[PDB]
Amino acid sequence: SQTSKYQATSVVNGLLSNLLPGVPKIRSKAQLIDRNLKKRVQLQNRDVHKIKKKCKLVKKKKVKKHKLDKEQLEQLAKHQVLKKHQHEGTLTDHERKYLNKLIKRNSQNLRSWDLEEEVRDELEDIQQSILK
């Protein structure tokens, strides 16, 4: 059909782009010869590496955005599954190590606020002198 013909034309255009990047996709006599020479000069001037980089940067950016979205969704699903394991009480032994690590990190962050061991004795003595 027309869609099949368009798909074949797109496949041919993609093959042409893969073989020679920087070439456009397919959709007087002395002047035509000079135009052919100018087209050869333009093909020499254009860099296959430059066009390849200009396309691969956008392709890698789109792929990285899709992969980041998929990884964020997978992490959120894993967190929800771990939470609903914790609610059910059937968390695995391989599981809940993340829970213990999060608890330890939050405990360290909270206990960092409290005090220091060396200043504790001085604070106790000064507090005893203030309160007495």
Add this chain to the structure above:
Amino acid sequence: EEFGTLLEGVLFFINSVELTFSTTEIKEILFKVLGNVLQILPVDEFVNAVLPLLSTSTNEDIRYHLTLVIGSKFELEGSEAIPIVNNVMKVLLDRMPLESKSVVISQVILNTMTALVSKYGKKLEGSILTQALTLATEKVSSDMTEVKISSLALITNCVQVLGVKSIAFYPKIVPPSIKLFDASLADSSNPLKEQLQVAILLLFAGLIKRIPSFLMSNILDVLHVIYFSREVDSSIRLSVISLIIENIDLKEVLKVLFRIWSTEIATSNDTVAVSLFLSTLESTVENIDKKSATSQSPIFFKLLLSLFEFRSISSFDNNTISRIEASVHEISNSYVLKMNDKVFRPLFVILVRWAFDGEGVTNAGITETERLLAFFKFFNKLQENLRGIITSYFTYLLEPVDMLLKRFISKDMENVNLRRLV
């Protein structure tokens, strides 16, 4: 199974909404629902559900929609799913005889397999690639337009993936490629067929990139096909010829180009073909570097003489023929820059013989006066470029010139341009 059934129902609705209503908003809503369903399920689960769905869906449109969904899953680029993609490609190859019944289904399956092979590269095993190349040869034998174009693309991808493994099946497929190019030249029924010929040229370029030795062996056929493909892009043909110029040796490429020009380009009156041959010769001369022994001066001299004779006897305009002759003079330039006096002096003697006696002329219809005028222009350009020992060659060339001056004194040669050149 429930997800596969929902996806099959959505694909059937999208494929048969027009048939049931016989609509654009409904199709857009169905596409949005299909995209949501694809984003809901992982690619591996979607592939595992869609693997029985292709066999379950007897509708060719539903099978094509499932192939498009699998193509979207592959264009998501799951790296770990590539072995699962390999199993899906094996299942697609199994369903390909069933997909070969419908032209659109076969084209969609071939395009999806080619896209999957291009995305995978050499990451997976190439036995499936060789089987796909055999199926592509079968589709080329079937000779539908879109199916043959997709088969050529898949064969090029499989050859790029295999490399040395595809070099075994390469000589068995190249004369079929020449036959397909001849058939595309003979029949111009469709712009799809023109695009299929362009894809055949692209496959020839890919085979040249993959196997430089086989490309050098069949360079004459490739150059003939590139010259005959007038419907193809001239810039793309010039780029393919340049790539063949790096892959092939310069002297052998020049000899093959001279043979092809004598066989076809001199015979053909097409200005586009003449310009393509001149551009190929100029590219070969520009890429010709070092090579103190040129190893073929008479081949280039006979090519220049045949170019002058073809400009004289051509149906093209005189101004275009003069521009082509100026291009031929620019091509003959830098041969003087390649300076081997022990090689140049017999070459200069042969050039003087072709100028005056015209020994070994490619065409006898070329006038001796016109040949002398062209050789005088070339000799003046070479003397202006080099000098030095050119005056020593001018001493040898003066003795025929003195007879020519005597003929000029006797007014045997009435060419004012030739007299001014002398």
